[PDB]
Amino acid sequence: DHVDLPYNLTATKIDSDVFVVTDRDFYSSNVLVAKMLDGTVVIVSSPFENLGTQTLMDWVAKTMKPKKVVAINTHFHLDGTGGNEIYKKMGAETWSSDLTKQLRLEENKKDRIKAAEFYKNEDLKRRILSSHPVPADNVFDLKQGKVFSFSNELVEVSFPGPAHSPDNVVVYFPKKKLLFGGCMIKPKELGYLGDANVKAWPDSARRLKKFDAKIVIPGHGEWGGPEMVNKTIKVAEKAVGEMR
Ligand SMILES: O=C(O)[C@@H]1C=[SH][C@H]2[C@@H]1C(O)(O)C2(Cl)Cl
Ligand SMILES: [Cl-]
Ligand SMILES: [Cl-]
Ligand SMILES: [Cl-]
Ligand SMILES: [Zn+2]
Ligand SMILES: [Zn+2]
Ligand SMILES: [Zn+2]
């Protein structure tokens, strides 16, 4: 059961006050939206650009009516920082690691038109170039992580080590037993390897086994239970082996 939104987003209820919003135009990217017991809404990751993000925020506004929104970037890629322009414009409080902010600014130095070449889809290319990704307004030291407390309901952000990217963090909701693992959760294949640390990935994923989690949410594709971590570890080990 899902609700269809503008620009090919879909919202699925996966629990009480917990939804996954998926951007099916841009690699089926997952965005977690969780309403805290005290009414604060927490958003993890983002759609790639301004139309998807505005659609997301409209739906959050209508269906949850929050007084406060906290948005947490999972890494510097567009499924991660692409929502910041609109989150900030809508009044949300945007957070990321210091390294994530740094890499986002670095990536922005690059020539967009030469960079966005690798879409081929003219409609998507125009949407991409009409957005201009910015870093979060608030930062924490990567290796220290960050803990939010919303009337004693906790949201924990931590760095398990480099894997999909040098800066990838996970977000854990203890009361709801929910882990958003993002793009280091890769149960079938590793995907985009450009910013990846394949050698370090198996131990980085092993660090996620400690979480008491009934649900694990990956950056792309269908979510699952704690077995998502086990599969990832095996996929990561296979790659290390093949490349020696
Ligand atoms: O490995 C991933 O996480 C993904 C594979 S395709 C897509 C996504 C991403 O890195 O955001 C691109 Cl390369 Cl745009
Ligand atoms: Cl800019
Ligand atoms: Cl803290
Ligand atoms: Cl308690
Ligand atoms: Zn549908
Ligand atoms: Zn990524
Ligand atoms: Zn991704």
Author numbering: 32 to 54, 56 to 61, 61A, 62 to 207, 214 to 224, 228 to 251, 254 to 265, 294 to 314
Quote the original article.
The São Paulo MBL (SPM‐1) is widely distributed in South America, Europe and North America, in the Gram‐negative pathogen Pseudomonas aeruginosa. Like other B1 MBLs (NDM, VIM and IMP),10 SPM‐1 has a binuclear zinc center, but has loop characteristics of the B2 MBLs, suggesting it is a B1/B2 hybrid, which, consequently, may be challenging to inhibit. SPM‐1 is distinguished from other B1 MBLs in possessing a “wall” of hydrophobic residues involving Phe57 and Tyr58 on its L3 loop, Phe79 on the loop connecting α5 and α1, and Phe151 and Tyr152 on the kinked α3 helix in the “closed” form, as well as Tyr228 on the opposite side of the active site cleft.
We then worked to obtain a structure of cyclobutanone 1 complexed to SPM‐1 by soaking crystals with excess inhibitor. Electron density maps for the latter indicated clear Fo‐Fc difference density in the active site into which 1 was modelled as its hydrated form. Wat1 “bridges” the zinc ions and is proposed to act as the “catalytic” nucleophile.10a Relative to uncomplexed SPM‐1 in the same crystal form, a small (∼0.5 Å) movement of Zn2 into a more solvent‐exposed position in the active site is observed; however, the binding of 1 does not cause significant structural effects on the metal center with little change in Zn–Wat1; Zn1–Zn2 or Zn:protein ligand distances. Notable interactions made by 1 are in the vicinity of Zn2. The C4 carboxylate of 1 makes direct interactions with both Zn2 (2.48 Å distance) and Lys219 (2.91 Å), a binding mode likely involved in substrate carboxylate binding in most B1 MBLs. Binding of 1 involves hydrophobic interactions with several of these, notably involving sandwiching of the bicyclic ring of 1 between the aromatic rings of Tyr58 (consistent with the 19F‐NMR results) and Tyr228, and edge‐face interactions of 1 with Phe79.
